[PDB]
Amino acid sequence: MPIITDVYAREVLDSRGNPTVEVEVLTESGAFGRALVPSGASTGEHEAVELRDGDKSRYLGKGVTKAVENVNEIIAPEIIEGEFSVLDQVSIDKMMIALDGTPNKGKLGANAILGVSIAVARAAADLLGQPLYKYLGGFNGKQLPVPMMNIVNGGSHSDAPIAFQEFMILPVGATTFKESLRWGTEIFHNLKSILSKRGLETAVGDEGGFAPKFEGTEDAVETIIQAIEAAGYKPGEEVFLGFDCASSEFYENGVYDYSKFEGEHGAKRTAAEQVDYLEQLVDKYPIITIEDGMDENDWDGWKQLTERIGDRVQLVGDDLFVTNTEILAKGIENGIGNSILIKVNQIGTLTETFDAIEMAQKAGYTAVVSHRSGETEDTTIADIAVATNAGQIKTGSLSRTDRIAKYNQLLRIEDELFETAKYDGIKSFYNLDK
Amino acid sequence: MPIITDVYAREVLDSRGNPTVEVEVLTESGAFGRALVPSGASEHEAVELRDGDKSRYLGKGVTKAVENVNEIIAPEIIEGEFSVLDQVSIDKMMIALDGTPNKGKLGANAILGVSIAVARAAADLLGQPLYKYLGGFNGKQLPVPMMNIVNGGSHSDAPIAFQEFMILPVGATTFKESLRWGTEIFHNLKSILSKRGLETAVGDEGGFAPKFEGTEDAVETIIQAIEAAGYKPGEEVFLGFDCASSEFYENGVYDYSKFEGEHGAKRTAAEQVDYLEQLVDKYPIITIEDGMDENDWDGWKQLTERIGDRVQLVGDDLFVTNTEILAKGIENGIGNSILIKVNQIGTLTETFDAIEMAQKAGYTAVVSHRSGETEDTTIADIAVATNAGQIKTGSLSRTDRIAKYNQLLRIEDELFETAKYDGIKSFYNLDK
Amino acid sequence: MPIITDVYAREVLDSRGNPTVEVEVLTESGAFGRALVPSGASEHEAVELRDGDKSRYLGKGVTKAVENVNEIIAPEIIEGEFSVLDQVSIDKMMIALDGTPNKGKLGANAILGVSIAVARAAADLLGQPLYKYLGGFNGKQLPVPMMNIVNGGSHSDAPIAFQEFMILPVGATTFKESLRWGTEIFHNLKSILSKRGLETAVGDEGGFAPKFEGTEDAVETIIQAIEAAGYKPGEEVFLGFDCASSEFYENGVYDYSKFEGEHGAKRTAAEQVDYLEQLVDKYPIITIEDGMDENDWDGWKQLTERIGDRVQLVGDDLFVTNTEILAKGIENGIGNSILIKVNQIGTLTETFDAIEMAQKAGYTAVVSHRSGETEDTTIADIAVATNAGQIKTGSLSRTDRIAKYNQLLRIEDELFETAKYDGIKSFYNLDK
Amino acid sequence: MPIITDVYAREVLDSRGNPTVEVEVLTESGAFGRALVPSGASTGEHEAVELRDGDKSRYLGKGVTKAVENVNEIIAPEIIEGEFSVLDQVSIDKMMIALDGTPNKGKLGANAILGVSIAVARAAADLLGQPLYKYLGGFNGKQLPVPMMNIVNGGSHSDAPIAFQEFMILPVGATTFKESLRWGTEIFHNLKSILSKRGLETAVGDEGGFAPKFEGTEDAVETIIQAIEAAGYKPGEEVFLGFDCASSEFYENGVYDYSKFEGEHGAKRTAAEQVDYLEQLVDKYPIITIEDGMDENDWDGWKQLTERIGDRVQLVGDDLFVTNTEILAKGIENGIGNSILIKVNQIGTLTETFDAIEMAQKAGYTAVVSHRSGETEDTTIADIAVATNAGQIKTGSLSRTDRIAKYNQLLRIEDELFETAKYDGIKSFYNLDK
Ligand SMILES: [Mg+2]
Ligand SMILES: [Mg+2]
């Protein structure tokens, strides 16, 4: 029954219109799994890199035929001839890491390897008749994540004078994930009206949120607040706010240079002034989470920021950790941050992904599983959040199926869990004292 | 074994963030089907059921529809011991159970959910690809895609009357190649827009709504993106419109001033035809959807006599996926193509009847998406099952659209050397 | 197929010769699970049900608990048609069926028996090793074992206050190697004791209770056995205590005179901390269990501030595998590790919640045996399922202990090249 | 279905902390059996010898990697390539005896061979859906054994001035095995109190019984009696006593030298005086069984002892017979003893074990299946006693799971047998006239 008999990859498209890898796994008894890999980075300092073709005359160089070939001609024959059972996730993942033989995964491609890794796990779940989350996390996978819902974009994703890349709402005060999703959409739609009445742009970006021409950061925040209240919810209690500052995008030579995005008179802040500024914002607005508040290399700044607001505010390393456990470990040992953004394709296997989540959790950090800019109809990250009782997810705004499909999968998971389902609300932030 | 043992509905979300119905069907032997219903309409149209509870989802909840499946439709199926393979008796039974031509008591969305999920479960039981279960052994023709790229009319702040502008990669050898071109043209257009300082964020169907100066600006810029990607506008890639002329038609006149400024022409039926013929003569346009008002039957006649031999004329608002109205169009020689919106008629059986009617009249049947979509890909399989030759399932952005394209890629891959992509020969309705 | 068709309990014996509960679960398809319950306690603790019939087993019979399974719990499961895979709903249902927080109406031992046997049967149905069914695909980390070797306090006639002395073979490469070392050290100690004319018979946990002269004699002799076996006390093998200080704590004072003669120090909270720090500075001690009284929260704070960065401080009596109390310890920064006794909380679900809480607070969760054990090996699989990193399951003597060790050997063997043994890195709770 | 497809051995630990062999057998249809071998002797005169590694730097020379290798590299390939069905116990056992080719089993190791032998039988029982006892003994295996329960130790297992190695209680007067076990524990626990009140040692030895510092043999016996009575049972009727004298341990040159263990003034008895002494003890105390009352080589003494008390007292050869049927046969032909201790690993296969039991039974002797000092979680000897309607077992005191697990298995066997179960009490001693 469980021996893997076929592993097949093909070229398909992601939510941005760019090629990506899809892999299908079949066992001798006919259990089946399909995996679609989200967009990645083909160059980087510390992450698994995906393999692109570079053929300027197909898909503007973004085709993934090489990665597809590597699956079909290198990985699949090793798996088939090895007679691996679909249940041996870790050996298969370890075999693929060694077969690529680079820390990068850049010989075979992180996209090739991950497609296989997830396809196998899904096939195993199908074979056992298990919901994926329980196969991945065992019998006690039951906690639905509080979602970080992208609502407004800035920085390099906007023309408006705003340095922070993304603003989010978090419906922590709901009692079920189902309710939390509802609130999200109500707030989203109310915001759309408000923007439309103001004559601002209503079309959406990659994450399915808005990038309107606000006057600045406070305009943006306060308008979100207004949308929360207009929908009938309370900002301090039921719905909270979050940032992805992506501060690396505007940091150079020890200066957080807000004028890269906020125009001539934007503040040029030192590390100590960046912290003061974020503390001010947090004392003013009901902000529960900040991603990349300091630069990916400003560890002293991260330290300062963690010492100052880390007891009562979640601080998420994205560019800081890059889903790398050697870097996460150094962060943990130095008391920097209290949360890590887990991007599955940035590390490249399910096994390594679960090791990062476990490492994070065991240090009292939160592990927030994350979408990419180019997503697919794959809903695996919803199952991973519940499998690990992660307590949080970041999978986009409240439009576009590349985002909504994950929310739908969470609805199905909560439904199926029935009376065993758990939604911890504010207690999901176990990384926080106050 | 094929007897249906569970029919279960659930409230989920569509691509616009509004509630829709999901239905799951199981047979005694463990075969499984899931359907999600696209966004619809709450005359002459199957209607979806919305809750109207101002405190939930702004009145757009579908708990009553979900409840109609679980408390009314499911027990009828289950107690009736219907086989999962008896698609037509199940659909028929649901139409009778609802009792109104509207499908308004149970909801088109309750009914269609079941209808699709039953078919998918049948395909699962039989080990068949869905397109082959639906269409028989000969379902093998991949559609030329109508790819939305620019929006106007009420979907834009720009002074353009027509609602959609489309590209059609007819000249490609395979569906796979044609999809590639779509994306390359689309990405070239994107960077041309940002180089002109125009807006790049997308709407419901994953396309652009840029502030162009006018209809000629939009078209000419689409053409330039096609050429900047290295494809020939006359032969490899054609253009298409959805004018949605019903939107700017008031009191016997096509009032472009509704969307196109203060000096937009007020146009008579004869002047519309002239303008459309002008555009067709001045640009490589192969299809026009709703070029005339839904009730301007005289105008439709005129337009079909004028350009029908060489341009596809698609009724959307004109036929509303209603076979009574389609029959009348055919009998009176109006149009040469019909947009099929599965949730607008409400069953798979009626959808296939509607397609069959169209095809037997020498019309093309263009299976279509809705503004609010889902992760569901059934419309891809319908297109191939009926060798329709065409599909309209959005731009090259948003998984709500791309998922359908991806499913066509899997279908073509699976079909291997039996797969067919006709290109310009897909337009069997066109005398030219 | 996964529906539970039989739940059956039976009176058997534990490793001390006292009655305990055995439960067997069967599914429709023939999948099978057997659990045996370890010895417990008849406040803030799940309680086991004892018969109290002075004419049977000296009042320790469990016929009423067995009867609660067979006449009350089983029919609820069977009539409810629970799937064997629905571990959390079954446990939840049993908690509600009992109704008291104690688990005192049905008995923690009735409930836990069912809970474990259901999981084992699920693992059997799925063809999965139990650690993988319980923990998901990534359960692969073998625990460093806390190996009891010498006993004191109320488990010895010798003048020693602390109840247990342990070795930890942290420096080993594999669990297999670490188990080997345990046995070699233990057998070397045995012959050193018989060469000194000291007692060699073993207690409940398979260790020794020799009449040493004092606490320094015991420790120094353990170290010598470690060195006589060719291992380095500082790096390869560390020591550990279970002081069980609650035992000699009266009226605000740690009264070593309870066990340590007539001139054993009466010690204040501050003087306990000093002494413990002294020992830690003078010997390679990596863990202390219950170094302070179960109710001396101020003292625990003090001790954790003092040595918590570099010594593991385990609450046993302090937390009583109760998440309300654990939460408070975490909130107040007391301890850095919790002893998990599955029968002290009473379900697998609550056990995993308790472990999860601990791990998420940066605490280690040390799965534990009880004085009265059985041939059951589930705690081995729990340790690996949760990648706990540690286990406390006895000395290197008695199958009640060795069976668990043997099961860890099978687990490691089965895991093959995926198996992990972290050694000193298992102490992720320790800043040093 | 029944063909053996895998035979696998590994190193595990016994109840004394020493390596032993564990073997697992699988058939093509997935029937499974696991066997753990108890401690043996690696040298001997007349027994199967187990194979130890002799590597002084692993497990102090007691590792069994060689035996494990022999299973995996010699026995398993013969079984797999031979395509033996799991049901052909005797051919497989005969094949292993010949493959080792020595009377000792010392080439491959008695531990290697037995592990396989039992694993196969268990797999066969699993394959057929049969309780093991019925597979081994056919449909009429239904008699629960009267247990010989170790309670007090002496001789070389004690510092106290007592020559006899072990003292036992036998709850012959109970009506079920279940009840008989209860009585055992009640007596055991009562004895523990009494000893504790006397200030004597309460820790346990290998068999889970006591080795306290009694004044001598009578002190020991009478204190056991006291514990019987204090628990509410009658010494002459419900509970009887037994010995393992292990008289070989203190015999030399025709002298039973009690001073080897009972100090300066211990009696030095001739063979005729040993018999008188045992007869005296039996007339004084309710002793129903004596193991190795005479030396393993003192056949004339054994004769004398059998002629004198053999009609009314059970006399068990352990060191005398060494589970060897050539020696048992000579004993039977010479009228020596009336019972034999069956140690499965001393002979080395299940087949040979059943031949010894059958030989014993057919001579009107009793066959008492026995534990070893180093035991395991294996419960096979419980099934063997019932399979053969042996009527007696010797599997230790009433503590330690290495002992209790056998008692538990007997409880399960009795339970499952239900109304067909049989516990003969005193009539189990069919070898006795009076
Ligand atoms: Mg239209
Ligand atoms: Mg303790």
Residue numbers in the entry:
A (entry chain A), D (entry chain A): 1 to 434
B (entry chain B), C (entry chain B): 1 to 42, 45 to 434
Can you quote the paper on this entry?
The multiple functions of Sa_enolase encouraged further exploration, leading to determination of the crystal structure of Sa_enolase at 2.45 Å resolution. The non-ligand-bound Sa_enolase crystals belonged to space group P4212 and contained two monomers forming a single homodimer in the asymmetric unit. Structure alignment indicates that the two monomers are nearly identical, with a root-mean-square deviation (r.m.s.d.) of 0.2 Å for all Cα atoms. The monomer–monomer interface is vast and has a buried surface area of 1747 Å2. The dimer–dimer interfaces within the octamer form along the outer edges of neighbouring butterfly-like dimers and result in a buried surface area of ∼1287 Å2. Structural comparison of non-ligand-bound Sa_enolase with yeast enolase reveals that the non-ligand-bound Sa_enolase presented here assumes a conformation similar to the ‘open’ conformation of yeast enolase. Superimposition of the non-ligand-bound and PEP-bound structures of Sa_enolase reveals that conformational changes occur following ligand binding. The primary difference involves the orientation of L1, with residues 36–44 moving approximately 9.5 Å towards the centre of the active site in order to cover the catalytic pocket.
